[PDB]
Automatic annotation (TrEMBL):
Coiled-coil region: none
Name recorded for this polypeptide: Sulfatase
Residues annotated for Ca(2+) binding in this entry: 14-15, 55, 342-343
Keyword Heme: no
Keyword vocabulary terms for this entry: Calcium, Hydrolase, Metal-binding, Signal
Chain positions covered by the region annotation Disordered: 506-526
Keyword Signal set for record: yes
Annotated ranges, domain N-sulphoglucosamine sulphohydrolase C-terminal: 348-503
CDD domains linked: G6S_like
Source species, domain of life: Bacteria
Family: Belongs to the sulfatase family.
Binding site for N-acetyl-D-glucosamine: 55, 181, 354-356, 441
Length: 526
C-alpha cells in the first residue's frame, strides 16, 4: 500500500545570476557542461523569483514556504531564525526522511530538522573552510578542512550519501559558498576564463535618469563600490606606492582575507597568477588609459567577470560529481534534483553587482529541476514561481502534504507546472516582494511591490518614491512610467492588486517602514 517516496537533492548556490546559468545559447558566457546536461534532462524555470533578494532571508523563505515577515528572518541581521517554527526539513524528517545539510546556513541558530549538519560559521571561506557541527553530547565544535570550499562541500555530501540509511529516502541540502563575494576561483581554474571578448551590458554606464532618486545613492556599483585588492585581487605590493591612492575607492582598500587562510604554496600559485592583472592595472594607469573613470569601470567589470565565472567552473564540477553519484547508485529516477541560487545577481546591469533590488536581475533566481519520468526533459518553463513555493513542492513530492503541514505555507506546490511545463489554469497572477535591510550594506532601500506577468510595481519606503516598469516595452527597466498618463489606469489597478496581496499575505501596516522606523522584528507566524 505505501507509495515510494523520492529522495530530494537540493543544491543551492549563493548569488548565482540567471544570466550565467549555462542552460542554453544565451546564458552561457562560460561553458558549463554539467549545468547544461542537468537542464537537458529537466526543466529550467525562466520566470523564477525570490520574495526578498538577500541571502539569509531567501533561505528562510525556502525553508518555510512563507514571506519574510511571517518567518521572521527579514535581513542578514543578528536576530536568529526561530527554528522551532514549521520548516520543510522537519516535516520530511517526521515523515521518515533522513536529512542532511552541508555548507552555508547563515541563519544564526542551529539548524533544526536535520539529522546531520555541518555548516560554515557565517559566510564561509573559499580556501580551507571551517565547519561547525555538534558532538554526540550536543556541544558545538569547529573544524577546518583543507581544500577548496566548492570541492569540500561536494566531498562531504557524497560521503554522507554513501553512508546513508538507504531504506529511508534522503533530503540533502548542498549549500555552496560560490559564487558569493569575494569570488575566489579554485587554483586549477585560474586562467581558464578569458573575458577579452565579452562586452559589458548596454546599461553598464547607467546614469539612473528616469529612475527614483534613491537609486543614485546605491552602494553596489562596479565603478565605485568594489575593493581593488579584495574583490578584484590586485597585489598591493606590486603597485607603485604613489599610484595606490588613485586605484582605491575611499574605504575600499581592505585585504583579501582568503590569502591568510592559504598555505604558502597556495598563496604563491594565486599571487603568481594575479601578478598579470595587477600589471595590467599599473600599465593602464601609467598610460593614462584607466585615468578615464569609465575605462577603469570597464576594466573592473572584466576582472569581476573573470573571477565570478571562474568560480562557476567548480560549481559545474560539483553538479557533475553529484549527478554521477546518483547515476552510478541507480537512484536517478527516484530523486527530485532541485538547483537554485539563493537569489540572482547583477552582472554589471545598471552598473551594478550584488542583489537586493526588485529590479529583474536580482528579483529573479535561477531554478532547475530534474525528476525523470515526472518532469519533462529539456523544457523551459515560463510560469511565474517563487521561492516560497519550494517548501510546498518538496512536501508534496515527499507525500507529506498533510493539511497541518500544507496550511502553514503561503507559497503553492510547483508540481502541476513542473509536470507539464505549462502554466496551470487560474495560476497566481502576481507575487509579492519585500526588502528590509536599510540601513544596511550596499544601501539598498526598504522597498516592496508586486511582479505581474508584464509589470513590476514598487513603493520605495526609504525615499517615498513609487516606480513602475512595463517589461513588455522596457525589459531593461530604464524608464519609470508611474507618472505617465498612458499608465494611469494600470497604476490604479496594480496599486489595488498590491494592497490586496499585502492583505492576503498578512503584511502589517507600516512594514517594511520608512526612514522614521527601525528595521522591524517579527515573531514567526503561520
Ligand atoms: Ca546570496
Amino acid at each position: 500500500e505505501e507509495n515510494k517516496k523520492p529522495n530530494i537533492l537540493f543544491i543551492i548556490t549563493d548569488d548565482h545570476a540567471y544570466q550565467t546559468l549555462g542552460t542554453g545559447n544565451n546564458d552561457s558566457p562560460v561553458a558549463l557542461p554539467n549545468f547544461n546536461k542537468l537542464g537537458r534532462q529537466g526543466m529550467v524555470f525562466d520566470r523564477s523569483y525570490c520574495a526578498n533578494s538577500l541571502c539569509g532571508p531567501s533561505r528562510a523563505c525556502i525553508l518555510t514556504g512563507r514571506h519574510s515577515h511571517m518567518n521572521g528572518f527579514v535581513f542578514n541581521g543578528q536576530r536568529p531564525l526561530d527554528g522551532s517554527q514549521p520548516t520543510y526539513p522537519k516535516m520530511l524528517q517526521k515523515a521518515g526522511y533522513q536529512t542532511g545539510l552541508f555548507g552555508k546556513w547563515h541563519l544564526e541558530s542551529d539548524p533544526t530538522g536535520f539529522d546531520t549538519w555541518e555548516i560554515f560559521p557565517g559566510q564561509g571561506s573559499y580556501y580551507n573552510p571551517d565547519f561547525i557541527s555538534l558532538k554526540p553530547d550536543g556541544k558545538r565544535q569547529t573544524k577546518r578542512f583543507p581544500g577548496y570550499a566548492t570541492d569540500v562541500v561536494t566531498d562531504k555530501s557524497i560521503q554522507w550519501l554513501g553512508n546513508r540509511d538507504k531504506n529511508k529516502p534522503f533530503l540533502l541540502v548542498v549549500g555552496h559558498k560560490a559564487p558569493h563575494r569575494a569570488w575566489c576561483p579554485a587554483l586549477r581554474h585560474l586562467g581558464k576564463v578569458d573575458t577579452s571578448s565579452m562586452t559589458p551590458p548596454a546599461n553598464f554606464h547607467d546614469d539612473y535618469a528616469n529612475r527614483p532618486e534613491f537609486l543614485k545613492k546605491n552602494q553596489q556599483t562596479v565603478a565605485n563600490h568594489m575593493a581593488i585588492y579584495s574583490d578584484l585581487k590586485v597585489l598591493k605590493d606590486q603597485v607603485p606606492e604613489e599610484m595606490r591612492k588613485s586605484i582605491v575607492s575611499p574605504g575600499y582598500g581592505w585585504d583579501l582575507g582568503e590569502l591568510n587562510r592559504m598555505t604558502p604554496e597556495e598563496k604563491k600559485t594565486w599571487t603568481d597568477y594575479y601578478a598579470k592583472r595587477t600589471k595590467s592595472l599599473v600599465d593602464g594607469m601609467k598610460s593614462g588609459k584607466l585615468k578615464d573613470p569609465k575605462a577603469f569601470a570597464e576594466w573592473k567589470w572584466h576582472a569581476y567577470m573573470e573571477d565570478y565565472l571562474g568560480c562557476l567552473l567548480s560549481v559545474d564540477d560539483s553538479i557533475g560529481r553529484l549527478m554521477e553519484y546518483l547515476d552510478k547508485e541507480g537512484i536517478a529516477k527516484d530523486t527530485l534534483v532541485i538547483y537554485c541560487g539563493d537569489q540572482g545577481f547583477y552582472m554589471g546591469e545598471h552598473g551594478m553587482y550584488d542583489k537586493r533590488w526588485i529590479f529583474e536581475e536580482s528579483l529573479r533566481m535561477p531554478l532547475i529541476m530534474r525528476w525523470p519520468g515526472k518532469i519533462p526533459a529539456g523544457i523551459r518553463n515560463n510560469t511565474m514561481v517563487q521561492n516560497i513555493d519550494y517548501a510546498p513542492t518538496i512536501v508534496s513530492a515527499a507525500g507529506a502534504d498533510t493539511p497541518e503541514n500544507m496550511n502553514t505555507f503561503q507559497g503553492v506546490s510547483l508540481l502541476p507546472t513542473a509536470f507539464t511545463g505549462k502554466t496551470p489554469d487560474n495560476w497566481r497572477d502576481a507575487i509579492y516582494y519585500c526588502f528590509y535591510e536599510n540601513p544596511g550594506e550596499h544601501n539598498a532601500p526598504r522597498h516592496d511591490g508586486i511582479r505581474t506577468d508584464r509589470y513590476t510595481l514598487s513603493y520605495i519606503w526609504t525615499s517615498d518614491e513609487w516606480m513602475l516598469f512595463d517589461m513588455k516595452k522596457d525589459p531593461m527597466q530604464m524608464k519609470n512610467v508611474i507618472d505617465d498618463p498612458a499608465y494611469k489606469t494600470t497604476v490604479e489597478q496594480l496599486k489595488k492588486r498590491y494592497h490586496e496581496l499585502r492583505k492576503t499575505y498578512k503584511v502589517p501596516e507600516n512594514s517594511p517602514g520608512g526612514k522614521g522606523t527601525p528595521i522591524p522584528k517579527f515573531d514567526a507566524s503561520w
